[PDB]
Amino acid sequence: LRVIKRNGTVVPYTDDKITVAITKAFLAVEGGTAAASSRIHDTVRRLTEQVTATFKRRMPSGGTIHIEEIQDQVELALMRAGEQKVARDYVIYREARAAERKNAGAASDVAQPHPSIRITRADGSLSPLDMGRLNTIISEACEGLAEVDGALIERETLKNLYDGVAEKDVNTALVMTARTLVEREPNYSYVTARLLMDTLRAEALGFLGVAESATHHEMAELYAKALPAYIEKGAEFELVDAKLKEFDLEKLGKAIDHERDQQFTYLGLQTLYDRYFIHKDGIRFELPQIFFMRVAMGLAIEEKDREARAIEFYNLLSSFDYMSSTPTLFNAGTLRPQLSSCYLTTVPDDLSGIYGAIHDNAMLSKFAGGLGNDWTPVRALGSYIKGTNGKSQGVVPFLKVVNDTAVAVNAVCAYLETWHLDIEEFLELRKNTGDDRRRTHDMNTANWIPDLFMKRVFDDGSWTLFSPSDVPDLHDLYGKAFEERYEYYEALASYGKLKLHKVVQAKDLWRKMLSMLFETGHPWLTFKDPCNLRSPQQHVGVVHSSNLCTEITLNTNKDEIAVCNLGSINLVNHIVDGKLDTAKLEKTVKTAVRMLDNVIDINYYSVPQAQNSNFKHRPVGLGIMGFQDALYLQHIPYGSDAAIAFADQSMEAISYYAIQASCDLADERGAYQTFQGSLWSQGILPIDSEKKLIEERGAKYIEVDLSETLDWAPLRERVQKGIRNSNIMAIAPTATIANITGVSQSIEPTYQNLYVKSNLSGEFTVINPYLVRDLKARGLWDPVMVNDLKYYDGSVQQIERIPQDLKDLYATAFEVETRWIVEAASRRQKWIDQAQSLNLYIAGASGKKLDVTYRMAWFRGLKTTYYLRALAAT
Amino acid sequence: GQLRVIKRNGTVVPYTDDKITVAITKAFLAVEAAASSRIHDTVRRLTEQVTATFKRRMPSGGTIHIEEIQDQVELALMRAGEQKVARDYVIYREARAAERKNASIRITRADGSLSPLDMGRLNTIISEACEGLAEVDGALIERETLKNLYDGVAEKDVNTALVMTARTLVEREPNYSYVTARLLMDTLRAEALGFLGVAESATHHEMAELYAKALPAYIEKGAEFELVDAKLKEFDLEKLGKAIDHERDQQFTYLGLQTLYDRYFIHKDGIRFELPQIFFMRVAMGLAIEEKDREARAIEFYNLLSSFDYMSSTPTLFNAGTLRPQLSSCYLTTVPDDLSGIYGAIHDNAMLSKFAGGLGNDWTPVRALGSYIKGTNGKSQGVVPFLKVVNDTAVAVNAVCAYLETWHLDIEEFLELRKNTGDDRRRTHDMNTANWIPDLFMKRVFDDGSWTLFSPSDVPDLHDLYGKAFEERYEYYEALASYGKLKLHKVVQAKDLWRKMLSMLFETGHPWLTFKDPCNLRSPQQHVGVVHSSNLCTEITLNTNKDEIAVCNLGSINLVNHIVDGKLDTAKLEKTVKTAVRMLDNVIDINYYSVPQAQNSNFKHRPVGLGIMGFQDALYLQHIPYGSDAAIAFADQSMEAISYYAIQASCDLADERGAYQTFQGSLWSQGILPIDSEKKLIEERGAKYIEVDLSETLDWAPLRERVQKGIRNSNIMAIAPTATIANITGVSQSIEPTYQNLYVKSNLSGEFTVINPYLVRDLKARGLWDPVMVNDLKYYDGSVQQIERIPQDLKDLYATAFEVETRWIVEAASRRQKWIDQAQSLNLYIAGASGKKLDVTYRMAWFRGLKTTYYLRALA
Ligand SMILES: Nc1ncnc2c1ncn2[C@H]1C[C@H](O)[C@@H](COP(=O)(O)OP(=O)(O)OP(=O)(O)O)O1
Numbered sequence A: 001l002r003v004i005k006r007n008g009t010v011v012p013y014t015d016d017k018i019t020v021a022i023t024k025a026f027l028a029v030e031g032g033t034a035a036a037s038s039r040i041h042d043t044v045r046r047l048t049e050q051v052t053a054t055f056k057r058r059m060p061s062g063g064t065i066h067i068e069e070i071q072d073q074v075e076l077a078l079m080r081a082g083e084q085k086v087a088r089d090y091v092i093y094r095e096a097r098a099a100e101r102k103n104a105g106a107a108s109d110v111a112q113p114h115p116s117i118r119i120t121r122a123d124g125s126l127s128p129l130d131m132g133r134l135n136t137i138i139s140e141a142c143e144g145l146a147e148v149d150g151a152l153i154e155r156e157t158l159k160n161l162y163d164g165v166a167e168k169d170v171n172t173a174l175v176m177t178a179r180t181l182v183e184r185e186p187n188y189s190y191v192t193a194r195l196l197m198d199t200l201r202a203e204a205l206g207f208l209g210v211a212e213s214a215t216h217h218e219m220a221e222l223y224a225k226a227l228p229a230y231i232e233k234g235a236e237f238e239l240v241d242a243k244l245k246e247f248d249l250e251k252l253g254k255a256i257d258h259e260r261d262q263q264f265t266y267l268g269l270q271t272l273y274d275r276y277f278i279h280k281d282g283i284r285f286e287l288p289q290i291f292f293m294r295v296a297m298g299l300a301i302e303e304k305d306r307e308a309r310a311i312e313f314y315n316l317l318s319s320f321d322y323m324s325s326t327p328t329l330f331n332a333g334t335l336r337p338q339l340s341s342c343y344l345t346t347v348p349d350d351l352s353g354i355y356g357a358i359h360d361n362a363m364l365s366k367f368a369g370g371l372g373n374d375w376t377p378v379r380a381l382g383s384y385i386k387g388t389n390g391k392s393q394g395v396v397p398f399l400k401v402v403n404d405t406a407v408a409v410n411a412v413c414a415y416l417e418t419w420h421l422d423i424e425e426f427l428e429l430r431k432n433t434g435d436d437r438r439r440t441h442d443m444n445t446a447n448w449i450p451d452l453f454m455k456r457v458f459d460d461g462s463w464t465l466f467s468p469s470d471v472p473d474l475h476d477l478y479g480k481a482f483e484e485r486y487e488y489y490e491a492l493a494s495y496g497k498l499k500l501h502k503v504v505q506a507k508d509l510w511r512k513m514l515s516m517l518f519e520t521g522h523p524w525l526t527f528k529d530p531c532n533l534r535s536p537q538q539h540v541g542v543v544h545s546s547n548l549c550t551e552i553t554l555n556t557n558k559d560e561i562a563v564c565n566l567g568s569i570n571l572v573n574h575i576v577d578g579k580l581d582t583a584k585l586e587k588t589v590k591t592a593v594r595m596l597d598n599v600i601d602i603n604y605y606s607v608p609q610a611q612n613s614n615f616k617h618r619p620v621g622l623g624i625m626g627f628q629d630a631l632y633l634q635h636i637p638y639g640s641d642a643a644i645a646f647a648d649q650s651m652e653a654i655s656y657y658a659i660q661a662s663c664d665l666a667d668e669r670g671a672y673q674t675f676q677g678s679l680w681s682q683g684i685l686p687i688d689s690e691k692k693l694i695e696e697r698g699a700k701y702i703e704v705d706l707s708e709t710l711d712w713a714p715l716r717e718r719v720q721k722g723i724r725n726s727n728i729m730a731i732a733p734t735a736t737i738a739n740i741t742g743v744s745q746s747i748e749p750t751y752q753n754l755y756v757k758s759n760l761s762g763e764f765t766v767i768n769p770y771l772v773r774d775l776k777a778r779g780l781w782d783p784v785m786v787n788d789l790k791y792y793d794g795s796v797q798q799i800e801r802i803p804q805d806l807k808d809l810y811a812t813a814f815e816v817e818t819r820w821i822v823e824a825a826s827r828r829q830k831w832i833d834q835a836q837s838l839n840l841y842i843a844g845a846s847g848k849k850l851d852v853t854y855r856m857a858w859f860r861g862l863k864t865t866y867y868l869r870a871l872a873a874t
Numbered sequence B: 001g002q003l004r005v006i007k008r009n010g011t012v013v014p015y016t017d018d019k020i021t022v023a024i025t026k027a028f029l030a031v032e033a034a035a036s037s038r039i040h041d042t043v044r045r046l047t048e049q050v051t052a053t054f055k056r057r058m059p060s061g062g063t064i065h066i067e068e069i070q071d072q073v074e075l076a077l078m079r080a081g082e083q084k085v086a087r088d089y090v091i092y093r094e095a096r097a098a099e100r101k102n103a104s105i106r107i108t109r110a111d112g113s114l115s116p117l118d119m120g121r122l123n124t125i126i127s128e129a130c131e132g133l134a135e136v137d138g139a140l141i142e143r144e145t146l147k148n149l150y151d152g153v154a155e156k157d158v159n160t161a162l163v164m165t166a167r168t169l170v171e172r173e174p175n176y177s178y179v180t181a182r183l184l185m186d187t188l189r190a191e192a193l194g195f196l197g198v199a200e201s202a203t204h205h206e207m208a209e210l211y212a213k214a215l216p217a218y219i220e221k222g223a224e225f226e227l228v229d230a231k232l233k234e235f236d237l238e239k240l241g242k243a244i245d246h247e248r249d250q251q252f253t254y255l256g257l258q259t260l261y262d263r264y265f266i267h268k269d270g271i272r273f274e275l276p277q278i279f280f281m282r283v284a285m286g287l288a289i290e291e292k293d294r295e296a297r298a299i300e301f302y303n304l305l306s307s308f309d310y311m312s313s314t315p316t317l318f319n320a321g322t323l324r325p326q327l328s329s330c331y332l333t334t335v336p337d338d339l340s341g342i343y344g345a346i347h348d349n350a351m352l353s354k355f356a357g358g359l360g361n362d363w364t365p366v367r368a369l370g371s372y373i374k375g376t377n378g379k380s381q382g383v384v385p386f387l388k389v390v391n392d393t394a395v396a397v398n399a400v401c402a403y404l405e406t407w408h409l410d411i412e413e414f415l416e417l418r419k420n421t422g423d424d425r426r427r428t429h430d431m432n433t434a435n436w437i438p439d440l441f442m443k444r445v446f447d448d449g450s451w452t453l454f455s456p457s458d459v460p461d462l463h464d465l466y467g468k469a470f471e472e473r474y475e476y477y478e479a480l481a482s483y484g485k486l487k488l489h490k491v492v493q494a495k496d497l498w499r500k501m502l503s504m505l506f507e508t509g510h511p512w513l514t515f516k517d518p519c520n521l522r523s524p525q526q527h528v529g530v531v532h533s534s535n536l537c538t539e540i541t542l543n544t545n546k547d548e549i550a551v552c553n554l555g556s557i558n559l560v561n562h563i564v565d566g567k568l569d570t571a572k573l574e575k576t577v578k579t580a581v582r583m584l585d586n587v588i589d590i591n592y593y594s595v596p597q598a599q600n601s602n603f604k605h606r607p608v609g610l611g612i613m614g615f616q617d618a619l620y621l622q623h624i625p626y627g628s629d630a631a632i633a634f635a636d637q638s639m640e641a642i643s644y645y646a647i648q649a650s651c652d653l654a655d656e657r658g659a660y661q662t663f664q665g666s667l668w669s670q671g672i673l674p675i676d677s678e679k680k681l682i683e684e685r686g687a688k689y690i691e692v693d694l695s696e697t698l699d700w701a702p703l704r705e706r707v708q709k710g711i712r713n714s715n716i717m718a719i720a721p722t723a724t725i726a727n728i729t730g731v732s733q734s735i736e737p738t739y740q741n742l743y744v745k746s747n748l749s750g751e752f753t754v755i756n757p758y759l760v761r762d763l764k765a766r767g768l769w770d771p772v773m774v775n776d777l778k779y780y781d782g783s784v785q786q787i788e789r790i791p792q793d794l795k796d797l798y799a800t801a802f803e804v805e806t807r808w809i810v811e812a813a814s815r816r817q818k819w820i821d822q823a824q825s826l827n828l829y830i831a832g833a834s835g836k837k838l839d840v841t842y843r844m845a846w847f848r849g850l851k852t853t854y855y856l857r858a859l860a
């Protein structure tokens, strides 16, 4: 055994040097009277033995170890023996002599580090790294952001570079060490996006022949030069609609604001660049502000004032005040643009029309469309079939054809009404096990529940199943009319005059519905009668189901496939110093509704009955997003009366402006064809729809708040003169567009304040930017807090240092009681003419808890519910 | 209690685990990115350790300093092996300490009002607490206590701070034990005098006048609440108040005063209103309640108790002077061989244990497994199923020791009743056990003979026979059984059973070894009964029958107070013994008897048991090592003188009160004193099997002549364990050698290390007491054998229990037993664990004429 001295030399391993060292430390804390002590000597030689033994235990016949490796094991032996005073003075003294070595080494230091790395160009030529341009992009990137250190990033980058780096991976190196900093300061996310933009500018501009490279503020003059170059190459490759050349590109080139690139989060820019920016040969040649300008232009190709409206639409989009739906963003400004990709259908009870509906499913899904299918009219197991002289097997064998079409065309949701004789088989279609002939693992399902069924649940009544072919009028009836006609058929079956039927207990079927929702996630629960009694289009059709995402309530028939034309307001951009900017909200809603009305005319239609319904009724669906983040800005916890109040009044405000905007389009473009007879014609607004719903169903089964903070009487008058759209509002999921704009999803509570993305190199944690901002004000943002958040997967509950006001404000989806989410949705639904996609989160998971929850959802006048997220751990 | 942390700048905050967790976590994070997931869990363990250490150090709460916490955090990290984190914690902590160095008090009275701290009174109570003590520093106490105070500190917590400060200094200078006690007295005075209303507070000097005022108030208030016998009002309370000596409160050690305050001083609604000297006067008055000259005897008894020259037994201290006083709580019974008497005996156990009494049960007469029962036509299952009922009764009434003779056919099951594993129906985990060993059995061991087991129902006379009559009769039954004339029996080798007995004593601690024949042959009462067993603690040898439950009336002499100038003070010793024997004879008459068999035996035979304590300390004051012939001679001659004065005292009481009812026929009437009965035992057993020193130093012949004229007590002497009364008087337990010279008292008040005060005094006298010596003693757990600086004479003197050869203990015990008419509780200590060493140890105990042995404390 030998030891590597501090500097090179090798010497034999001598226990004495260890024994002397430890003895020095004992004699330092004690006096000299400890010099001759059997105790010290016995202790030291014991510590020296277990140290020397440790080196023997890990190695065979001799070896070599570092001098510091021995010092560490000496401290270990002293420490494990509980020698606190001797161990710490050993550490202190040892560190004092390390300081003298470190300092003396720095005094004798010589400086060589030079020159610089040579950046390799694409053509293969070497070039010295530009330090001036490197400082420019990182400074313009840290511009306007707090607690960001540009010099810190430049130093950490400069480390991981080698002679012969390419300018390609010099930017990625800047990005790599920029997102590693978002964990301790979220504002680096903006810095990370601004650095990545440098690659995009070089990529796009170099492709367009404008410039081989450029900085941010250099875009103040280059965005106008790049736009006409972009349109010319875009149309050349048939990636952009040639009609866009009819715009005044010089005027639009000046309207572009290059500073809005600074708004992007890293995730938002990645999203657009990966999937939305136009490209050729893998090269993205569409820059972000030109992307927003393309969408604006595509939405204005038929406006009288092309440029003025295009600028109005570009300003709304590029500022993140509002964001068009995913299909609009992707296809606006391109040939035959699919601007809407959400449809509702109803399937007729004949074989030709069944397979006509299968055919429509395939065509509508050819470009990623989502579908709701009303299958209630199709006759159930045991029904007679003339011509065949046999008996039907019901809807499920046809749903299997639907299921395999969805697989073949690359989602769809089937709806069935609760008295349908196939309902029991329907509830089990998504079980993991069992007969596969009775499963549709690639198709969604939803219950179309009449009020009467829930009434029978509340009252422990019975419930009769029928085949629709024996009761063909029930599906189209609703409200009192349905309940009278249904009880007539019920009495008929009890007197043997309607053979094909099944009597069950309503509570038993209800329990089966909730257990399948819990076990399989399906079928979802949607309510037929509020969707129909509150539909503004009752005079010209019937709502036969909702859509794939359960927020749309539009009529369907033989000649009408309803189309959802969607967009969402960004509530975050309408919160100022803690308050809702009522004034700015009206301006954004007015422009949003116009853009959505334009979508109807520009949209390219594949099936004629989808064009027919859109042109006849002109429904749109204006939603919201950033609700949870808007609560943060007001310091309102989602589980409070104050959040329920904000949800009520914010929807009432948007609703007023949205309805008012539709009146303005009616003055300019004329009311939609079927306006005459609609609820709007009768002066029955959504707030009035709630009142009549309570009258119809009865206060015994529904209770909803009816408060109002605005004056609707003047608007209730102007609406009767005409509006442009049969439906205005719908709150849909906003997965992509919330990520693009950097806000929370629609109305969802935060699912978790922390997530650990891991998809390239290492894993990068992302923490709720609002949570960290509040923890700074309290002075509670530090390394230990970060280590606690990871341990608790982002939950601020049960960490002592956070005060209770923040534990409540940053409660996660599974630690907010479900009643808050339902009551909030209930008050938003008072002002929405369609519905809202409502995910529910339930910890504890019991059939009892599901019962009280979905009874409450119905009792509070909700039209739809969506996914159930259930945990049985609590 | 409330754990309060004192900041670096005086302020006070509540104790919060989180502060420690955050600090330790920062150090973990300073070292390390993916393996950082285990930080939260390991840190929470380390925090829990630290919090548990302060809970264990301050179970009732208290104050603590930041730097004290910091040191416990470091120690916790260091013991866990977190070398990287620990060293980084140290470096950072020192860095901040470097940075820091460069860059009034009011009290909350019980009524909630505030007032500045009376510095003047604080100086006086500290100064008066240091009176007469060397190496005590009143200024240090004041400065160190002030560091632990703060603005708004509760009144009581000031005294607590004083007591805690003084208590930690006990390990540096033992006299601080007296300081700690005297400082504690201040809260006792305020608590008691405020309750009685004679004063709201008082200093020690003020008690010179206030004790006399507080005695009448105490008797009246106590009598009113039925906590004191109303007859104590008949005493001249003025004359007894003047007799109280306030300076005797300055004698208390901290442990002794704390013991009296927690468990003895009369209390009402949680308030002790009985002060120490009043406590001793109540006991004295309680023991003098039937005396002709009540005041003179009460003063006589008060002077004996309050001086610590002698201390009555715990039950006497508890209950003397109260209504229906249980002054004795130690009993012996014998269980007859019939079911009604078996359950009568169990009924007696419950009744006698109703107030913490201890019991010795003789179960030998109950017939063994296999015996015929004419109740039915079945077989007995032995004594153990009934011992199970005894066990459950001890548990339900919560202390009981069952005795079984060595030929009993259930003995092998009896030997295993305290094993930790096995069938619980063959175990009695809450009941003690002891062997009742005949001399013949040991003779068989010495000679490697056989041994036959019988059921007592076939040999019902053996248990009461002893000596040569037992041996003749036993060998008759032995031969009778060898050829079929005795159905139920079992032959074994005596050596094999003896090995099992010793193996069970070592592995389970039970059963103990006691010797039936020395107890009976030397009993003064052989003419009226038979000793059937010893008691719970193995020091008492008294007769029992169906009409007589024996009662132990006990007290012990403090030998420390009878050594002056390194020599035994026989004049003072004579005075102490005479008064002590009187007090014990009074206990018999005053004691309330709930069982008539107990009253009958006490009134007929009037046995008492005067013992000793402080023997080890008495050796220190003479510089006599326990392991030396000088210790044997002191053990011999000190008990000889005590026994002489005690026998003389009992003659004096017979002159005054009459001899006890069964005196005629006793060994006393035959002129057979304990020294004579020892010589008789030698002749009876045979010199081959016993050897005891028979030297005398006193002139016993005239006393032998006087004893035959009449004595007051059938038995006089017994060395009991003195755990509590030795702690009250601050002396070593009974005859035990020092167990350890250094240990950690882990009380509910906190923790403090105690160091042998005689050892510290001798080391100071030689200039060897310093911090290095302290750490040497802590390292070696009090042992001085491996400390080179300590001279050899002190190494011998301060050897501890496991370092004194067991032969020394047995010989000293053998010499004491020459003079004692009953027995002595004798613990033995064996460091070398082996059956061979156990064999020679307990053979020697029998061979040296010992009556009993007690616990075996062993190591391997
Ligand atoms: N022969 C050896 N074998 C093993 N460990 C050794 C040996 N010599 C030294 N060490 C270890 C034990 C101590 O922790 C430390 C010794 O410190 P020290 O005696 O000062 O030696 P060193 O390497 O620092 O040289 P120097 O004499 O200048 O101090 O290194």
Ligand SMILES: Nc1ncnc2c1ncn2[C@H]1C[C@H](O)[C@@H](COP(=O)(O)OP(=O)(O)OP(=O)(O)O)O1
Pocket: A020, A021, A022, A024, A025, A028, A071, A089, A090, A091, A093, A094, A097, A098, A101
């Ligand atoms: N006064 C002291 N207090 C505490 N520990 C000490 C003291 N003196 C020595 N030691 C311990 C810690 C050191 O590692 C070792 C002494 O070796 P020493 O050579 O003086 O230090 P070192 O090896 O760490 O540095 P260097 O040799 O470079 O001066 O023993």
Ligand SMILES: Nc1ncnc2c1ncn2[C@H]1C[C@H](O)[C@@H](COP(=O)(O)OP(=O)(O)OP(=O)(O)O)O1
Pocket: A349, A350, A351, A352, A354, A378, A379, A384, A385, A386, A388, A392, A393
């Ligand atoms: N061969 C078949 N296999 C399975 N289902 C069938 C078959 N033929 C008909 N059906 C089902 C599909 C429809 O739900 C229902 C009605 O079928 P359809 O072709 O429309 O007859 P129909 O409408 O001309 O006459 P009717 O409705 O009066 O019986 O029967």
Ligand SMILES: Nc1ncnc2c1ncn2[C@H]1C[C@H](O)[C@@H](COP(=O)(O)OP(=O)(O)OP(=O)(O)O)O1
Pocket: B005, B007, B008, B013, B014, B015, B016, B017, B019, B020, B023, B066, B069, B070, B073
């Ligand atoms: N209230 C408390 N309860 C328990 N331990 C505490 C408390 N305050 C501090 N500590 C202990 C835990 C660690 O050993 C150490 C941590 O020091 P620290 O948290 O910095 O307190 P501090 O007195 O130094 O105040 P600060 O550092 O905030 O000025 O002190």
Ligand SMILES: Nc1ncnc2c1ncn2[C@H]1C[C@H](O)[C@@H](COP(=O)(O)OP(=O)(O)OP(=O)(O)O)O1
Pocket: B022, B023, B024, B026, B027, B030, B088, B089, B090, B092, B093, B096, B097, B100
């Ligand atoms: N960076 C660190 N490295 C190692 N240990 C640390 C570190 N930070 C804190 N600790 C440990 C030791 C510190 O005493 C404690 C945190 O207390 P801290 O307030 O930072 O210092 P301190 O309490 O010793 O002095 P002060 O509080 O007066 O600044 O936890």
Ligand SMILES: Nc1ncnc2c1ncn2[C@H]1C[C@H](O)[C@@H](COP(=O)(O)OP(=O)(O)OP(=O)(O)O)O1
Pocket: B337, B338, B339, B340, B342, B366, B367, B372, B373, B374, B375, B376, B380, B381
């Ligand atoms: N039912 C029983 N179960 C167990 N042991 C019993 C039972 N009855 C008696 N014994 C035991 C208890 C004694 O040790 C022994 C003698 O008891 P017991 O029959 O009451 O005495 P005895 O004197 O009245 O009758 P015996 O004529 O048999 O001596 O038998």
Ligand SMILES: [Mg+2]
Pocket: none
């Ligand atoms: Mg060195």
Ligand SMILES: [Mg+2]
Pocket: none
């Ligand atoms: Mg600190």
